[PDB]
RNA sequence: UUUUUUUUUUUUUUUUUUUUUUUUUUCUCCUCUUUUUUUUUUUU
């Protein structure tokens, strides 16, 4: 379990998609939240052409 | 001079069957009178 309280806003994003990409070898799921509409398409957009399915 | 967030119309389909109209009651029952019975025959 890993807590962040860092300054710039993508630098904290790599780990989470650290763990978005290693959770497709091991066939699970994640959720990720975003309490606000703006932000909650733009990570769907960014990982969209990136790899997968969002 | 009044911002931000609160998903939506159950899933399923590629199961076998070798019979035959109907159907099941009603009891014994005093017949009145000129008769033997006439008769061939011919014209259809």
Do not use: C, W
Not at 9 to 18: D, I, N, P, W
Not at 19 to 25: C, E, G, P, T, V
Not at 34 to 40: E, F, N, T, V, Y
């Amino acid at each position: 379990s890993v807590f962040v309280a860092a300054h710039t806003s993508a630098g904290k994003t790599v780990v989470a998609e650290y763990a978005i990409a290693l959770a497709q070898k091991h066939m699970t799921r994640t959720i990720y939240t975003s309490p606000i509409k703006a932000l909650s398409n733009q990570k769907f957009r960014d990982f969209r052409n990136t790899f997968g399915d969002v």
